[PDB]
Design a protein around this nucleic acid. Structure first.
Ligand code: NA
Ligand code: NA
Length: 327
DNA sequence: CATCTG
DNA sequence: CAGATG
């Protein structure tokens, strides 16, 4: 956790690079287990060979651990940190809509910057365009104080359109968090579930309303159950308009809301633990359900949940207020 | 995983 | 349809 930190960090730099710049998924994947293992490892790696000793740790990585331990730096790390081509990719990629794949094409075309991008708005698709238009707003965190305002709107409009809707803002926002990156509203309706054959309107109706009042400003992606967009808190009395924020709305069958809700609320670590406890308690859990573990090996059949309560109970556990869902 | 592009 | 992105 700090005893093999540099090592783990270098490895991660290396890993990421393989993947984003080269196309070295193997290699890339290679740095990863290595960091994962040395990461677990209980002592102070004092040398290459010592590390080599681990699994996932081979000759090459050892070599590197050597140089790093031997001197505060890595040549290769140093070479990549410079190289423009590499730096560009780390950069273009910052744009919502640009993954590595795209980042490579652009660079090989010479677009290596924001301006480049602008000059070539023609080569970018809808998503990417919005992403470019809001580069700035997109990187700005969302102060909870804003979140509450947003949340107030979404919730009210959903209400108007149908009393039967059930919306919830998952995220860290949910677990307390003073600010967040984006807004995800989990959504369900009684008239929508596991069997129930579809109801696209269910999601389209609300999205619409949201734009009707102007909360939503752009559409990144709109499918039958998942909407990806852009919203904004109405600029009060002209002098201070808000940044544009990322937002997601997802339809969930009412019969798998809470697991979902639970799930998305996190944290990752809270999940896992609750996840492992479940198991002990003779249970299975995932994104949509909680199942009674048979003994033959495994086994299923969806336990019936009405709240986040029904779940905990199941695995017989202390109901956790969202704030305490930390670890 | 669900969406989009081409 | 494979393949990218989030
Ligand atoms: Na991106
Ligand atoms: Na292939």
């Amino acid at each position: 956790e700090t005893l093999n930190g540099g090592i783990t960090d270098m490895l991660t730099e290396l890993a990421n690079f393989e993947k984003n710049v080269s196309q070295a998924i193997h290699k890339y994947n290679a740095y990863r287990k290595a960091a994962s293992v040395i990461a677990k490892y209980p002592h102070k790696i004092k040398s290459g060979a010592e590390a080599k000793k681990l699994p996932g740790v081979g000759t090459k990585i050892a070599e590197k651990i050597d140089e790093f331990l031997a001197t505060g730096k890595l040549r290769k790390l140093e070479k990549i940190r410079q190289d423009d081509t590499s730096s560009s990719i780390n950069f273009l990629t910052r744009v919502s809509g640009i993954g590595p794949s795209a980042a490579r094409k652009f660079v090989d075309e010479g677009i290596k910057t924001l301006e480049d991008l602008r000059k070539n708005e023609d080569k970018l698709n809808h998503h990417q365009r919005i992403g470019l238009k809001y580069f700035g707003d997109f990187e700005k965190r969302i102060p909870r104080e804003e979140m509450l305002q947003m949340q107030d709107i979404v919730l009210n409009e959903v209400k108007k359109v149908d009393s039967e809707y059930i919306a919830t803002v998952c995220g860290s926002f949910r677990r307390g968090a003073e600010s967040s990156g984006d807004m995800d509203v989990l959504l369900t309706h009684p008239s929508f579930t596991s069997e129930s054959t579809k109801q696209p309107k269910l999601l389209h109706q609300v999205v619409e309303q949201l734009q009707k009042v102007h909360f939503i400003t752009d559409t990144l992606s709109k499918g039958e159950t998942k909407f990806m967009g852009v919203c904004q808190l109405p600029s009060k009395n002209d002098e201070k308009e808000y940044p544009h924020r990322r937002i997601d709305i997802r339809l969930i069958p009412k019969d798998q809301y809470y697991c979902g809700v639970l799930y998305f609320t996190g944290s990752d670590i809270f999940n896992k633990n609750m996840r492992a406890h479940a198991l002990e308690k003779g249970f299975t859990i995932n994104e949509y359900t909680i199942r009674p573990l048979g003994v033959t090996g495994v086994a299923g059949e969806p336990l019936p949940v009405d709240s986040e309560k029904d779940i905990f109970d199941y695995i017989q556990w202390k109901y956790r207020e969202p704030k305490d869902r930390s670890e």
